[PDB]
Amino acid sequence: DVPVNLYRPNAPFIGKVISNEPLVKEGGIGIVQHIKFDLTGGNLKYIEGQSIGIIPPGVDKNGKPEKLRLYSIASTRHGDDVDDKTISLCVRQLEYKHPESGATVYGVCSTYLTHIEPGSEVKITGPVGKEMLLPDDPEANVIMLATGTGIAPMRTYLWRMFKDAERAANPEYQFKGFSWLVFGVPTTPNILYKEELEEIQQKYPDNFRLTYAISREQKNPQGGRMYIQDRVAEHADQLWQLIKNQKTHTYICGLRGMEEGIDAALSAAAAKEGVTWSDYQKDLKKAGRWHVETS
Ligand SMILES: Cc1cc2nc3c(=O)[nH]c(=O)nc-3n(C[C@H](O)[C@H](O)[C@H](O)COP(=O)(O)OP(=O)(O)OC[C@H]3O[C@@H](n4cnc5c(N)ncnc54)[C@H](O)[C@@H]3O)c2cc1C
Ligand SMILES: NC(=O)c1ccc[n+]([C@@H]2O[C@H](COP(=O)([O-])OP(=O)(O)OC[C@H]3O[C@@H](n4cnc5c(N)ncnc54)[C@H](OP(=O)(O)O)[C@@H]3O)[C@@H](O)[C@H]2O)c1
Numbered sequence: 001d002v003p004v005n006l007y008r009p010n011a012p013f014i015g016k017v018i019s020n021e022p023l024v025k026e027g028g029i030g031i032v033q034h035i036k037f038d039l040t041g042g043n044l045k046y047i048e049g050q051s052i053g054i055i056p057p058g059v060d061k062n063g064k065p066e067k068l069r070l071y072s073i074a075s076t077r078h079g080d081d082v083d084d085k086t087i088s089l090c091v092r093q094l095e096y097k098h099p100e101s102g103a104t105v106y107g108v109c110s111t112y113l114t115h116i117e118p119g120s121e122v123k124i125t126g127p128v129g130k131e132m133l134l135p136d137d138p139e140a141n142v143i144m145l146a147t148g149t150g151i152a153p154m155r156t157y158l159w160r161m162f163k164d165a166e167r168a169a170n171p172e173y174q175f176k177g178f179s180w181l182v183f184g185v186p187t188t189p190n191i192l193y194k195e196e197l198e199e200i201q202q203k204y205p206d207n208f209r210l211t212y213a214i215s216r217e218q219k220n221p222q223g224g225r226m227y228i229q230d231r232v233a234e235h236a237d238q239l240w241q242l243i244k245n246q247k248t249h250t251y252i253c254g255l256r257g258m259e260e261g262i263d264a265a266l267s268a269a270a271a272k273e274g275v276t277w278s279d280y281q282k283d284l285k286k287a288g289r290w291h292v293e294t295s
Contacts, residue, residue, distance in 0.1 A: 003045045003127055009068055012055060012123040013042040017116050018086060028189030031093040032149060033114045034074065036086050037122060044124065046087065047077045048156035049132030049251075049291075053125035054089075056109040068125055069109040072132075072152035072253065072293070075159070082165040087124075089113070090152040090192065132251060132291045134160070140177045141248040143239065145262065147184040147228055150254025151192050153293070154181055157251070162200045162208065176207065177247070182235075184213035184228035184254070211235070228254075229261025240269035243284075250284070252292045259292065 007013040015037040023032045046052065053068035060066060071089045079086035093114040094107025116122070134142070134157050142161075144154045160166050161175040185191055191212065201210045211231055212218075218226035220233075232239060242248050243266070252259060267277035284290035 002047060002130055002133070003050075004130070005126065005128065006044055007042070007125045009053065009055065009125050012053075012125045013039070013044050014121050015039060015042070015044075015087075015124050017118050017120045017122060019118055020114075020116055023090065023192045025189035025194075027187065029186050030095070030190075031114055032190075032192060033091050033093075034088060035091060035113060035116065036075070036080060036088045037124065038085065039079075039087055040085055044087065044127070045077070046073055046127035048073070048134050048160055049153045050127040050129045052087065052089075052127050054109055054113060055123035055125065056112040058108065060108075066108060068123075070128065071113075072149070073127065074152040074155050076156050076163075076166055077160075078166065078169055082163075082169055090149050090155070092149045129293075132253070132293050135247075135249055136173065137247065138173055138175050138177065139247060141242055141245055142177065142179040143242060143248065143250040144179065144181040145228060145232065145250070145252045145254075145258070146181070147254030147258060148190075149192070150252075150294070151183060153251065153253050154183075155193060158197070158200060158208075162204055178207055178209070178242070180209040180211070180239075180242070182211045182213065182228055182231050184215070184231070184258075186215045187217060188214060227261070228258055229265065232262050233265040236265040236269040237272075240266055249289045250291065252294065254294055256294045259294065 018036045018038050020033055020035045023034050051070045051072050053070050055068045056066045058066055074090040075088035078084050080088050091110055091113045094110040095104050098105050132153050146154050200208050213226045213228045213231045215225040220226050220230040270277040
């Protein structure tokens with residue numbers, strides 16, 4: 001049922017870029033682009049939470065062809081236009097200062113993508129992944145913890161759940177549970193899809209909660225910059241109480257250094273009721289209700 005590897009690296013699907021739009025507003029840090037590709041002419045199908053690979057042109061320092069890089073799909077299975085004809089990505093241009101050099105280094109595939117022009121042909125593979133799938137149960141509770149581009153799979157869940165056109169297209173999935181997104185980014189201008197996320201909260205106040213952790217505009221109780229683990233700590237009991245429901249699913253996507261703080265917070269909450277979080281968590285993973293995707 002779940003589509004996987006309809007296209008592989010040795011024979012990728014060649015899709016055409018339809019649009020490449022900026023997501024970081026003025027005054028924000030870095031570049032993050034929402035890129036939409038045309039899937040017509042191929043049979044690439046996918047579902048929420050999956051990823052696709054992108055093979056950039058060129059060779060590496062050793063003269064070897066560039067390998068694919070994975071990107072979390074940012075659109076629902078129907079595409080942003082709900083026409084089953086496209087797929088979108090949320091790509092940050094990777095750039096860092098070279099060790100003891102000061103010179104900025106630019107990621108190969110992400111620079112290629114963020115600067116790509118509409119009409120360009122791109123090699124796509126996939127889809128891949130069965131670790132971040134959304135429950136078919138419309139009554140489920142969905143906790144979403146994300147940082148930066150980790151918002152990608154969350155957008156696919158939230159759009160399917162709350163977009164008017166999606167609800168009209170998915171008679172089998174009329175969401176009426178509770179979803180809570182805790183999103184961490186450095187600045188307000190960096191809140192990806194801010195306008196749309198807030199529109200959902202306004203229209204579905206009883207079904208969607210939105211919490212931000214803005215590091216350059218907020219500080220935690222300790223005086224440090226506000227990060228996602230700080231928000232989880234702040235609402236640890238509320239989160240634990242929700243997680244206890246057998247119908248609750250939790251999704252974590254973003255940097256590889258966020259789970260540690262998250263676990264510390266939930267561990268203290270569960271310990272109050274004589275529960276060892278590490279063990280409970282293991283059981284949640286085994287049951288397919290604790291979804292993590294970081295790097
Ligand atoms: C399952 C999955 C989903 C992903 N989803 C997304 C997504 O939705 N959006 C997105 O933008 N990215 C996503 N990524 C990351 C993506 O796959 C690429 O790794 C990213 O875009 C960088 O690739 P690049 O080709 O631009 O950089 P490359 O040319 O491949 O350079 C990367 C290399 O630079 C070095 N490096 C990286 N960071 C630093 C640093 N901070 N300091 C010093 N050295 C460093 C490392 O040696 C690294 O191997 C995802 C990754 C995976 C595994
Ligand atoms: N499938 C996957 O494995 C998957 C999928 C999608 C994304 N990703 C990963 O997620 C990352 C997205 O990064 P981005 O560039 O989009 O992020 P970003 O916009 O630069 O920032 C995200 C926020 O996280 C903060 N942060 C730093 N260390 C943290 C920690 N240990 N715990 C929690 N927050 C921390 C940052 O701090 P400051 O404000 O102080 O800078 C910032 O506010 C990528 O590196 C990508 O590899 C992985």
